[PDB]
Ligand binder design. Structure first.
Ligand SMILES: O[C@@H]1[C@@H](O)[C@H](O[C@@H]2[C@@H](O)[C@H](O[C@@H]3CO[C@@H](O[C@@H]4CO[C@@H](O)[C@H](O)[C@H]4O)[C@H](O)[C@H]3O)OC[C@H]2O)OC[C@H]1O
Ligand SMILES: OC[C@@H]1O[C@@H](O)[C@H](O)[C@H]1O
Ligand SMILES: [Ca+2]
Length: 895
């Protein structure tokens, strides 16, 4: 959006305002570069906010060269600023100069193109025609804003307009010391984490996504503030998340206010809202990258940055090389470590991205490798299921990153998108949500994942905005709901972690179960040879008969669980890593292990057979993950290792997953197969070798249905389980065996502590206010003409006598607060809107007429008493407005 001419005039009006701010000694309160400094937002101390453009939109019509455009600058003579045109005095008729500040006029010279295609400049009733305007790229009259010492802020221009220096606002409240040192929010088997997205694509009200997470889950949740990298190809400008900084800031404040942990996700490919660094020093001394230190310093609940699907979109005009991104991570991990945060990376692969996978990450970047090793506690590596192939290759490597000591936690970011295009799997073209439970439960339980991220797509599998709903007193409000699969698969699965059914193994427990690791020591050949796992590594182990090797591996369901996920690492960094029983150098792999039959033989000696059948069954201690990844009813015969009976025989429907806990005289089964459309599945369970009549009991979970029939005949107990969705089934069954293992003491789950209380300003977006009788609600601002808003939109409150907005705000304590209302009133002052706090009128804000420009906002202040806890904010028209009133947000702050 936004034309050349609008950009040009925006800068003219900015110049006037800067010169007025100079003379009135206004300070710059804040400034922020956007789209890599293509533009900046400026806030002054009087509440005026506006944009300046270092880059100008091309003049329509598709010229490719740099062409002329009028440069309206300003120069001082005899103590006063006068306007320039292309570095000569701007004159009209008189040859008389025109003063920037005249107090008569409030209108700056306006640049335009007339009907004959000539540039024009107008001031008052006076007009001058300049050169023909030809289509092409233009240059700005404005260069950059930057900070000098830490006293001052300098605006620089491209045309001999002198530097304009303004004071930087020395703030009046005392500094809140940040959380530093220890991890802010420890993650472990005892304290798993779910990264739940507050997503730009849901156009979220952060408060409403937060409140969709039930109370028992919230303390284990880390809210992932997700900025989309959707952008215009030609200019680089972000659309969906036009203002990343502003989105992240607003949603992080809401998180902080809610006392919930949060991260920001500024990057999907190479693409990022925030500039990459090369030197640690930049975090404090470079005004282009303030965001990194700011979020850590100001929000004790902030944990850090999430760089997702780091496999694509490098070396674009508007992104960095992958090498640059790693050098960024090298410094950011240091910053992260200081503040006790996490840097999260996720990876999904293809054949072209071998040289940027988690092996290459450390094997090609020795400096990063060193930092990673030193600060591993602060670094989290996640397998992502977004691509079409290589699932086992990428699983093994992401696991290897953790087990080898380069990453301190291992996670999964599951995604519907990894369902094979066209044909799907098992004859199912469309992705069935039930499929998604299988890798998550398997990799958590058997490979020690402490982080679950998503699942994706957030806006299809997790949350959706509905139409507005009534909320009382004539107001409506935006509404979000959970997708049924989120409740019936993801929330319920996490509860099964919390309730100790699904015990997560520690790194050391995983290493001892896994036994074997491949070390990627190959420096000859192509990128796959040097960074990917051996082609045929999974063949004849857990690769399905209908699926192929490496980049022909299109299915993430394992054929058997006899063999652990096979980790692949670069190097083993610490003594724990070096305790692996079997170390295979990949350079020897083609020699010995590439012959499938030879490998299966040696693996079959290391890993004994503990069941038979076509189901996936894998065992850790007294716990089994058993699932059906194939079409049709599939079966397993599993001798008991802890239960005193003999064996269980299982017959499971397609996509039925189960976690089975063995006890001496008891079995539990967590079972799920959730279909949103309500189909019923049949499973069968047979226990052999009972020495008395068993009993059972069952409870459906979430929105699930179940019915269980039992049968005792000969010495065989059969349970037939009809269900949709999740259930817990208990079987009380004992036999004679004395040669059984002993169940461990109950595992530890520790509800993670809350963050430190946030002492800062709270923010509330108008586009999230409850409303009635407003002109327009802009929930997606990028397509509309107003710039320089916060979060993803704003509203046009409009001029109706019946117009009103409401919101629920909070206060830590009773006392006096400033409410800053960020508004626009572009055609006349508005004095017909009253503010209510807790259903009592507290005053009439002075919505003073603002400049016409598309970039200009201002702020009206009000002091009120709030009480501790929940308060009601309202703005209500009492009569027709003299003009339209736009609202962006309110900011509430202790006075
Ligand atoms: O709306 C936005 C989405 O369009 C955007 O989607 C990305 C998607 O574009 C990305 O696709 C990757 C692109 O890279 C390919 O690899 C290339 C293949 O050709 C080679 O010659 C080249 O060297 C190589 O890099 C991958 O095949 C392909 O999967 O996947 C991720 C997805 O998020 O994302 C942002 C949205 O806002
Ligand atoms: O627009 C970027 C998308 O949002 C992120 O959360 C996803 O992983 C990426 O695919
Ligand atoms: Ca807003």
């Amino acid at each position: 959006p936004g034309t050349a001419v609008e950009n040009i005039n925006t800068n003219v009006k900015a110049l006037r305002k800067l010169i007025e701010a100079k003379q009135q000694d206004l300070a710059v309160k804040t400034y922020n570069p956007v789209n890599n400094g293509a533009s900046y937002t400026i806030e002054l101390s009087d509440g005026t906010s506006f944009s300046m453009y270092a880059q100008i939109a091309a003049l329509e019509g598709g010229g490719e060269d740099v062409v002329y455009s009028p440069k309206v600058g300003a120069k001082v003579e005899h103590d006063e600023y006068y306007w320039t045109l292309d570095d000569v005095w701007l004159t009209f008729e008189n040859d008389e100069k025109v003063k920037v500040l005249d107090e008569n006029n409030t209108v700056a010279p306006i640049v335009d193109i007339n009907t004959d295609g000539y540039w024009t400049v107008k001031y008052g009733t006076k007009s001058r025609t300049l050169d023909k305007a030809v289509s092409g790229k233009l240059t700005s009259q404005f260069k950059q804003v930057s900070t000098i010492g830490d006293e001052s802020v300098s605006f620089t221009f491209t045309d001999r307009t002198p530097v304009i220096e303004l004071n930087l606002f020395k703030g009046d409240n005392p500094e809140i010391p940040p959380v530093t040192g220890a991890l802010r929010r420890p993650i472990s088997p005892e304290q798993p984490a779910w990264f739940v997205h507050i997503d730009s694509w849901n156009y979220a009200d952060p408060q409403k996504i937060i409140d969709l997470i039930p109370a028992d889950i919230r303390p284990f949740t880390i809210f992932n503030i997700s900025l989309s990298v959707s952008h215009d190809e030609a200019t680089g400008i972000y659309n969906v998340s036009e203002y990343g900084y502003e989105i992240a800031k607003s949603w992080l404040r809401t998180c902080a206010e809610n006392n919930v942990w949060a991260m920001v996700q500024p990057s999907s490919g190479g693409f990022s809202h925030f500039k990459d660094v090369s030197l640690y020093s930049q975090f404090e001394s470079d005004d282009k990258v303030r965001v990194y230190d700011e979020f850590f310093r100001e929000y004790p609940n902030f944990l850090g940055f999430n760089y997702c699907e780091q496999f694509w979109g490098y070396d674009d005009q508007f992104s960095v090389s992958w090498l640059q991104r790693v050098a960024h991570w090298n410094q950011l991990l240091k910053l992260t470590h200081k503040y006790g945060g996490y840097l999260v990376v996720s990876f999904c692969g293809n054949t072209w991205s071998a040289n940027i996978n988690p092996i290459a990450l450390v094997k090609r970047n020795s400096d990063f490798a060193q930092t990673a090793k030193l600060y591993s506690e602060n670094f989290i590596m996640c397998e992502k299921y977004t691509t079409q192939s290589g699932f086992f290759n990428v699983e093994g490597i992401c696991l290897g990153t953790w087990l080898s000591g380069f990453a301190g936690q291992y996670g999964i970011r599951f995604d519907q998108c990894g369902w094979t295009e066209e044909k799907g799997q098992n004859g199912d073209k469309d992705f069935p949500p039930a499929a998604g439970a299988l890798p998550i439960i398997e990799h958590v339980m058997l490979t020690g994942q402490t982080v679950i991220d998503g699942p994706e797509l957030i806006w299809q599998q997790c949350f959706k905005e509905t139409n507005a709903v009534s909320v009382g007193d004539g107001y409506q409000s935006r509404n979000w709901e959970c997708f049924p699969q989120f409740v019936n698969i993801n929330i319920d699965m996490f509860r099964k972690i919390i309730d100790k059914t699904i015990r997560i193994p520690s790194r050391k427990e995983v290493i001892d179960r896994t036994k074997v690791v491949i070390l990627q020591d190959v420096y000859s050949g192509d990128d796959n040879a040097k960074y990917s796992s051996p082609k045929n590594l999974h063949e004849g182990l857990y690769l399905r008969d209908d699926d192929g090797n490496l980049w022909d591996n299109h299915c993430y369901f394992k054929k058997t669980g006899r063999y652990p996920t096979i980790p692949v690492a670069f190097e083993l960094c610490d003594d724990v890593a070096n305790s692996f029983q079997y170390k295979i150098n990949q350079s020897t792999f083609e020699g010995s292990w590439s012959d499938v039959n030879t490998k299966v033989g040696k693996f079959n000696r290391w890993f004994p057979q503990e069941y038979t059948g076509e189901l996936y069954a894998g065992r850790i201690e007294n716990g089994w993950v058993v699932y059906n990844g194939l079409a049709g009813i599939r079966n397993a015969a599993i001798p008991f290792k802890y239960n005193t009976c003999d064996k269980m025989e299982l017959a499971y429907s397609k996509y039925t997953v189960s976690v089975i806990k063995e006890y001496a005289n008891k079995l539990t089964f967590y079972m799920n197969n959730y279909d949103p459309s309500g189909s019923s599945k049949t499973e069968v369970i047979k226990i052999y070798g009972c020495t008395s009549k068993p009993t059972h009991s069952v409870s459906s979970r979430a929105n699930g249905t179940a019915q269980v029939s039992e049968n005792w005949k000969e010495d065989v107990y059969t349970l037939t389980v009809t269900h949709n969705g999740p259930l817990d089934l208990t079987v009380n069954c004992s036999g004679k065996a004395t040669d059984r293992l002993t169940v461990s003491t109950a595992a530890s789950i520790q509800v993670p502590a809350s963050p430190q209380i946030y002492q800062g300003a709270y923010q509330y977006e108008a586009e999230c206010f409850d409303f009635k009788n407003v002109t327009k609600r802009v929930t997606k601002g990028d397509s509309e003409p107003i710039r320089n808003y916060t979060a993803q939109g704003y509203i046009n409150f409009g001029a109706s006598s019946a117009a009103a907005v409401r919101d629920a705000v909070t206060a830590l304590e009773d006392g006096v607060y400033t409410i800053r209302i960020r508004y626009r009133a572009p055609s006349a002052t508005v004095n017909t809107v009253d503010m209510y706090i807790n259903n009592t009128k507290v005053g009439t804000p002075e919505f003073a007429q603002t400049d016409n420009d598309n970039t200009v906002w201002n702020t009206a202040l009000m002091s009120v008493s709030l009480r501790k806890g929940a308060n009601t904010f309202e703005l209500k028209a009492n009569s027709s407005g003299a003009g339209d009133l736009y609202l962006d947000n309110i900011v509430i702050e202790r006075k």
